[PDB]
């Protein structure tokens, strides 16, 4: 009589995904992205994805492999120079992805609507902006049934629920059942991504027993419970090259190398050959070698 053991490998987790899925990716920009899970997606044949994200190099890498058909995002940023992700930029300037770009607060709102099984939530953000044109008739308004004091009724954006087939998130610590915590200054929205999704995969820096987890972090940091997770992946350094709260900062030198490698077909084949053509362990070894060389 035991709770389900949800431990699985990176490739196992991606093996539960299917082409054509809507997938939410946690973290924010170049911050605590599930980069090991993204690299496992690149190794797979899963493609034709609709991605919901606060975008960073996760979306860039997926674009480099032509895996994105449609993208819902509040922004795409590397957080450090050159700031714009060059693979997302290339997909955009080539017209390779349909975008439902939105105000950053609309992402949170849409995930909250999905988490509550609601079809929409009203929000002011978006009104009067070209968010309306990005979405056309996919984004409608809703009028308050209560007029304001003056007698005028407010008409607001009806942000539709961002329901997800799957969510991929990375956290600092978790147990084999999916209880999981962040360490550092920001949970981002990883709880909302899990709550909005059907299939939920969390990679963690380290898997520990439940009692170790709850004695290591405050209650408020326990952002995932067992009802929010379907698979748990142990992936040390699994957010590299993005930052990861208390575990490590951003590998700024390597992110620069990623961005500069996107400039030419030649630079990218070499990046792929060195970093993206083997396992996660092969990636981690090559990243360690890069750090030693560039000192």
């Amino acid at each position: 009589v035991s709770k389900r053991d949800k431990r699985i490998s990176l490739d196992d987790a991606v093996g539960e995904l299917r082409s054509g899925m809507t997938i939410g990716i946690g973290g924010w920009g170049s911050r605590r992205k599930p980069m090991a899970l993204v690299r496992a997606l690149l190794r797979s044949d899963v493609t034709d994805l609709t991605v919901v994200t606060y975008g960073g190099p996760d979306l860039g890498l997926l674009c480099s492999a032509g895996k994105v058909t449609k993208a819902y995002y509040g922004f795409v940023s590397l957080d450090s120079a050159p700031f714009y992700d060059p693979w997302f930029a290339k997909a955009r300037t080539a017209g390779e992805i349909a975008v439902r770009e939105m105000d950053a607060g609309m992402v949170k709102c849409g995930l909250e609507a999905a988490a509550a099984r609601l079809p929409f939530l009203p929000i002011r953000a978006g009104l009067g902006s070209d968010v309306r044109r990005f979405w056309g008739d996919e984004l409608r308004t809703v009028t308050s049934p209560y007029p304001d004091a003056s007698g005028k009724s407010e008409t607001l954006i009806a942000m539709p629920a961002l329901n997800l087939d799957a969510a991929l998130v990375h956290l600092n610590l978790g147990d084999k059942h999916g209880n999981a915590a962040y360490t550092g200054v920001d949970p981002y929205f990883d709880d909302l991504y899990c709550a909005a999704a059907e299939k939920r995969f969390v990679s963690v820096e380290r898997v520990v027993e439940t009692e170790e987890l709850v004695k290591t972090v405050p209650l408020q940091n326990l952002i995932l419970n067992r009802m929010m997770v379907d698979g748990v992946v142990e992936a040390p350094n699994g957010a590299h090259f993005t930052l990861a709260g208390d575990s490590y900062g951003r590998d700024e030198k390597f992110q620069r190398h990623y961005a500069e490698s996107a400039k030419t077909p030649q630079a990218w084949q070499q990046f792929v050959a060195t970093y993206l053509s083997g396992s996660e362990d092969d990636y981690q070894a090559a990243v360690k070698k890069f750090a030693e060389e560039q000192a």
Binding site: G74, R92, G128, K152
Partner: protein, 248 residues
């Protein structure tokens, strides 16, 4: 007192927050950041400021420095602050038009741009919820254009007066390397409030695609006080990082 162009820009960015009260000052570039912190150390002590990541500062630190904290402001809570209205953001801009529409998203067609930037970020939510100002370190006709490619920041010609959902829109200032501007011209048009010392009206006119209201009569930006110069040069920006962000 010899005062540099960047020092005039710094006090103009402080003046953005004059009368702001107990609200969150959210500058998104170095000059507005020095300005917000300068205001906090002079005439607006009740401003809230953050480290730009997740911590609310108790004291006012130098650029790039830590300070003792007074609260928590992760991104999910920033959205609550935006929606509460208790905030004044200073954004940058790739384009700003005569009515205050702003673009930091991309250039060209929406589904196939000719150049990609950040996407809209929080600009739509900022401009519809609370005071928004802009900083432009190199005032040119490519920035100040007739039509922005993508409306990420909402301008005055988008407002529906019949819908109270628009009632919180307010674009307060545009500060550039050439002067201080608002949207108080006729029909909410871009209007000159002051030109920095040494800037001429024709310099502004030659670097703005449209007519600037009140440009011929605009006076010169005020002098910094001795205290403001001390705070800029000794406390907030001793390495003169401000100069890197202010063009001729």
């Amino acid at each position: 007192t010899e005062v540099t162009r960047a020092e005039y820009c710094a006090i103009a960015c402080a003046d953005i927050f004059s009368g702001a009260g107990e609200i969150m000052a959210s500058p998104m570039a170095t000059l507005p950041l020095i300005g917000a912190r300068l205001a906090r150390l002079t005439t607006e002590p009740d401003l809230l400021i953050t480290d730009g990541e997740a911590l609310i500062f108790a004291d006012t630190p130098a650029v790039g420095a830590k300070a003792p904290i007074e609260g928590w402001m992760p991104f999910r809570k920033v959205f609550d602050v935006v929606a509460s209205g208790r905030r004044h953001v200073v954004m940058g801009a790739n384009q700003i038009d005569r009515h205050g529409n702003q673009n930091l998203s991309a250039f060209g067609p929406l589904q196939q741009p000719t150049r990609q930037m950040f996407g809209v970020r929080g600009a739509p939510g900022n401009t519809i919820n609370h005071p928004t100002s802009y900083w432009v370190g190199k005032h040119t006709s490519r920035v100040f254009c007739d039509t922005v490619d993508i409306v990420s920041g909402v301008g005055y010609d988008q407002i529906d007066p019949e819908n109270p959902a628009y009632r919180f829109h307010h674009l307060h200032r545009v500060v550039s390397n050439l002067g201080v501007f608002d949207f108080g011209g006729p029909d909410h048009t871009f209007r000159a409030l002051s030109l920095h010392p040494g800037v001429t009206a024709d310099q502004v006119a030659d670097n703005t695609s449209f007519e600037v209201a009140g440009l011929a009569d605009a006076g010169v930006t005020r002098e910094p006080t001795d205290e403001e110069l001390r705070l800029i040069r000794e406390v907030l920006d001793p390495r003169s990082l401000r100069d890197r962000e202010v063009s001729v």
